[PDB]
Amino acid sequence: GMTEYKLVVVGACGVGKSALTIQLIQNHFVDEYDPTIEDSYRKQVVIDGETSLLDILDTAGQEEYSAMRDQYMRTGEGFLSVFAINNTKSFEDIHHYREQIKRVKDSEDVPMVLVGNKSDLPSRTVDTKQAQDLARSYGIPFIETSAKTRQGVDDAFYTLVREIRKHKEK
Ligand SMILES: *CCC(=O)N1CCN(c2nc(OC[C@@H]3CCCN3C)nc3c(F)c(-c4nc(N)cc(C)c4C(F)(F)F)c(Cl)cc23)[C@@H](C)C1
Ligand SMILES: Nc1nc2c(ncn2[C@@H]2O[C@H](COP(=O)(O)OP(=O)(O)O)[C@@H](O)[C@H]2O)c(=O)[nH]1
Ligand SMILES: [Mg+2]
């Protein structure tokens, strides 16, 4: 059989949401992707032996708190909270995205995964230990990724699918 998953990639401008989603979907790195383009991208993959249709929302629109916007974001079954390891502000911004997800879901148990992207760059400003401690504080997994080299990309999205699955079995 198969299961579909609405996954949502969030995080500050430029952390690599689009590059991560395109790597997952098409298996290459897109270095210039219009920062304004918001769209969903589909991938079929087997995860732990079950066909999984991933419907991935790559967010990009202006910060907006309308009923329509809240209701759309609520459709996400799981969220990737993406920051870039050479951008400490994107790391601090993670709490804002977690908070907003919690708000529209009116739940403290939303499937989420913390993703530290750009792990191929030497210019790291976010300690891996710090990022691990943050995810532990949320009770969610942490995965270091590079959309450029594809390191950890499968692990990040598949972990999120697994978190949704567990939240179901619960
Ligand atoms: C380069 C353009 C780009 O990638 N984006 C990404 C989306 N986005 C954005 N930004 C913010 O906040 C920007 C900063 C941090 C806090 C102060 N502010 C100035 N917040 C966003 C969101 F909260 C959401 C969002 N919106 C609603 N209504 C509900 C939910 C659950 C969310 C969430 F993302 F958390 F899922 C969105 Cl969709 C996008 C946000 C810009 C940086 C533009
Ligand atoms: N070195 C490196 N650059 C990346 C990586 N992911 C994204 N980028 C670059 O970072 C910038 C923003 O990426 P983009 O996907 O547009 O970010 P978004 O605004 O979160 O969608 C672009 O210059 C990308 O080429 C990565 O893993 N490594
Ligand atoms: Mg983008």
Numbering used by the authors: 0 to 169
The authors write:
Small GTPases such as KRAS are composed of a G-domain and a hypervariable region that cycle between an inactive (GDP-bound) and active (GTP-bound) conformation. Hotspot mutations in the P-loop of the G-domain such as KRASG12V, KRASG12D, and KRASG12C perturb the normal equilibrium by inhibiting GTP hydrolysis and locking KRAS in its active conformation. In multiple types of cancer, a missense mutation at codon 12 substitutes a glycine for a cysteine, causing hyperactivation of the GTPase and enhanced MAPK signalling.
Here we present a 1.90 Å resolution crystal structure of KRASG12C, C51S, C80S, C118S bound to divarasib. Apart from partial density for the Gln 61 sidechain, the switch-II loop is well defined. Tyr 96 sits behind the core to form the hydrophobic base of the pocket. The quinazoline core of divarasib is positioned to form a hydrogen bond with His 95 while Tyr 64 and Glu 62 extend from the switch-II loop to form a lid. In the back of the pocket, a second water molecule forms a network with Glu 63, Arg 68 and the pyridine’s tertiary amine. In contrast, divarasib reaches to make an interaction with Asp 69 while maintaining a hydrogen bond to His 95; a unique combination not seen in the other drug complexes. The most striking observation is the distance between the Cαs at Ser 65 which is 5.6 Å in the sotorasib and divarasib structures.
